[PDB]
Amino acid sequence: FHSFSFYELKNVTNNFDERPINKMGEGGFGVVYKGYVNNTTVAVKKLEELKQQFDQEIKVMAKCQHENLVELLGFSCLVYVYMPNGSLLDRLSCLDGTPPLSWHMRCKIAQGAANGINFLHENHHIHRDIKSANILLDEAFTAKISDFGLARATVMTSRIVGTTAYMAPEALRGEITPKSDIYSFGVVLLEIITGLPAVDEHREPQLLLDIKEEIEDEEKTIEDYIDKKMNDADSTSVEAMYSVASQCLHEKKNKRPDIKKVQQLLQEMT
Numbered sequence: 065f066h067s068f069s070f071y072e073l074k075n076v077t078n079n080f081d082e083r084p085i086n087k088m089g090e091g092g093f094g095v096v097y098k099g100y101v102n103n104t105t106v107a108v109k110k111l112e113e114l115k116q117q118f119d120q121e122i123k124v125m126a127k128c129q130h131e132n133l134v135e136l137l138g139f140s141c142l143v144y145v146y147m148p149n150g151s152l153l154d155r156l157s158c159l160d161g162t163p164p165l166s167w168h169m170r171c172k173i174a175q176g177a178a179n180g181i182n183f184l185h186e187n188h189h190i191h192r193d194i195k196s197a198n199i200l201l202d203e204a205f206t207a208k209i210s211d212f213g214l215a216r217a218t219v220m221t222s223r224i225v226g227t228t229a230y231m232a233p234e235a236l237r238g239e240i241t242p243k244s245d246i247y248s249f250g251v252v253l254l255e256i257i258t259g260l261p262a263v264d265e266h267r268e269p270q271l272l273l274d275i276k277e278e279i280e281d282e283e284k285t286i287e288d289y290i291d292k293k294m295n296d297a298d299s300t301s302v303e304a305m306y307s308v309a310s311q312c313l314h315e316k317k318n319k320r321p322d323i324k325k326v327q328q329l330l331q332e333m334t
């Protein structure tokens with residue numbers, strides 16, 4: 065990774081200009097700014113606990129390199145290769161007027177995200193903050209898992225971290241297990257199918273994971289929730305992705321499939 069000076073990063077972002085269209089958005093623990101180097105567009109995340117998360121991000125990126133993981137370019141502030149299509153969260157909501165993702169693109173993105181998580185778990189890493197805001201999309205809409213500041217290389221902690229609407233029950237109690245990442249990925253799969261955010265305070269139900277119970281109790285069907293901003297979805301593949309999401313969202317962690325099984329199920333879907 066390249067060691068950048070703070071004044072270099074200050075200059076490439078127009079003194080960290082907070083106005084939107086150098087401000088691109090708000091990342092996990094700071095603001096993300098658009099920058100340039102040698103004609104390459106980059107993303108600059110300007111951030112004791114925070115220093116440890118900065119170090120963890122560098123350490124995990126040093127060990128983990130995969131097509132479905134973001135690429136860290138350097139640090140001072142963390143510098144990444146700019147992902148032209150932003151986050152899956154924003155593309156699902158069509159933020160800034162971007163066109164809705166097709167069912168075909170959604171399947172590829174789901175497969176890519178699972179391949180990324182599989183790579184992290186094979187390398188004995190638990191992400192701990194799997195969510196659609198942490199799935200970035202490059203120039204070809206390839207899914208890239210981001211934000212390894214909370215990553216860790218059964219087991220409990222006193223500092224419970226993560227995003228509540230995506231968290232497994234045992235993660236909310238303090239457990240650290242790769243099974244919690246599977247549960248969070250199940251919520252992401254529901255966001256892909258429905259186009260709905262994981263939590264909406266002005267919606268009933270507020271939490272997206274609650275639709276699993278509505279479908280099981282036959283109060284609603286998966287068809288009632290399928291994103292209407294698609295013209296190419298088919299019941300068979302949608303139902304197969306919902307079946308993976310349902311398995312991931314099992315309340316008992318040991319009943320959930322491992323990431324290799326999730327990856328297999330998503331491959332058989334297409």
Ligand SMILES: CN1CCC(n2cc(Nc3nc(NC4(C)CC4)c4c(=O)n(-c5cncnc5)ccc4n3)cn2)CC1
Nearest residue numbers: 088089090096107144146147148149150151160210211
């Ligand atoms: C209409 N059109 C306008 C421009 C737009 N757009 C492109 C982008 N690119 C973009 N955004 C990011 N962050 C946000 C999602 C903005 C919050 C990041 C990012 O956070 N990291 C990152 C941070 N920490 C750890 N690992 C990776 C790396 C790359 C990256 N790249 C944003 N918006 C697309 C739609």
